[PDB]
Design a protein around this ligand. Sequence first.
Ligand SMILES: N=C1N=NC(N)=C1/N=N/c1cccc(C(F)(F)F)c1
Ligand SMILES: [Co+2]
Ligand SMILES: [Co+2]
Ligand code: NA
Length: 263
Amino acid sequence: AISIKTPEDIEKMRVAGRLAAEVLEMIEPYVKPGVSTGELDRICNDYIVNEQHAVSACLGYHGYPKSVCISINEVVCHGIPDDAKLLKDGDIVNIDVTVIKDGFHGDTSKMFIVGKPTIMGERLCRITQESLYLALRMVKPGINLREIGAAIQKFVEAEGFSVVREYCGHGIGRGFHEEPQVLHYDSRETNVVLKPGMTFTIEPMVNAGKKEIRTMKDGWTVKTKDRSLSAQYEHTIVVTDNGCEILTLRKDDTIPAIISHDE
Ligand SMILES: N=C1N=NC(N)=C1/N=N/c1cccc(C(F)(F)F)c1
Ligand SMILES: [Co+2]
Ligand SMILES: [Co+2]
Ligand code: NA
């Protein structure tokens, strides 16, 4: 039975979502050729703890050792910040930030392209963000999550890309992952009719090549099986009476925070 957040809960999620977005805005000037992912993670954790007075939800989660996930190129998700891993020209990099503030979580991620983009990296990132945005435009009471997942998948596949099956968006609130699962592809098992006050993420992982993935022996890092590039963007939202409100919007987003479907 899916959680419905109160107005007071939603305001706390606005606060936490803003913090998560602000980590991404803060880190941008540091994402440059030559920086290590270990350094980026320290900058993020110091900011979260010392400036935001918040906590990373990733740190210690199932034993995860770092504060943000940083995934480069063929890494799909859960990449571990490493002092030895240096960013370089052409890399596509996801930074995924989840913070807890006043008991509530905010969860967001974006791609950064380092130095001169490669055209395929830029296209993959663009299509991935566009797939998130088309899903966000669909969210309103009465729509089924199945329709949203199906639409993401059709859009991505038409570009010759694929959707990763093993990971999904999620309800979010006092818990990091709550009901429902938010699949980014069509499934007969999905039957969730949205209601005002539901809060969840949408966070498609899109591969340039085939959909299959592999987890590395570190038990964390996930890569494309074919070593094709993979990209992801994520926002946390609340369903409103006539659409949704994005809780993790950044200045560089190009979709409005409040989406209304009323006349
Ligand atoms: N950073 C995230 N944003 N949305 C998620 N589902 C995220 N997953 N995060 C993690 C972070 C560390 C470990 C794991 C785990 F699932 F592998 F345990 C998941
Ligand atoms: Co996330
Ligand atoms: Co998430
Ligand atoms: Na990637």
